[PDB]
Design a protein around this nucleic acid. Structure first.
Lengths: 84, 81
RNA sequence: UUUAUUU
């Protein structure tokens, strides 16, 4: 719908930035927003972020390819965002 | 803040209650956490306690290291970087 | 075997 679908990415590095998210997700389809969550005191990435994709089937393709992807030396976890 | 204490060789079913019961008697404790596998939610075998007072943390460590928890011998120490 | 897990 209008909100799109929100994807949660875990196991980003301390120097990860929005550019790394756009680059990873952009290829699978329309991406409308990205955000890296950063540590209040250090300004480093706390290790996770969010990407909003418009179309469910493109979001599902992204998650299938990127969940388990090795970025630097860490195995990413990616899935649709849950509440909290 | 306080002094962070590392506890290794916790079993799968270990929880915060067991850590509170062990370390509580030695002095002020402000946090306990058991580390769990994100998927299975089973304790991965270690946890942490934060105690406020350096000398009380020392006493807990010297007293509890080698403590037998179920079938397992615990390793307790000041947390390393 | 030394805690970033959902803005």
């Amino acid at each position: 719908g209008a909100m799109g679908w929100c994807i949660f990415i875990y196991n980003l590095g301390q120097d990860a930035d929005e550019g790394i998210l756009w680059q990873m997700f952009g290829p699978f389809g329309a991406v409308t927003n990205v955000k890296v969550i950063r540590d209040f005191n250090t300004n480093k990435c706390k290790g996770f972020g969010f990407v909003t994709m418009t179309n469910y089937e493109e979001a599902a393709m992204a998650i299938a390819s990127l969940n388990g992807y090795r970025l630097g030396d860490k195995i990413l976890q990616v899935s649709f965002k849950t509440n909290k």
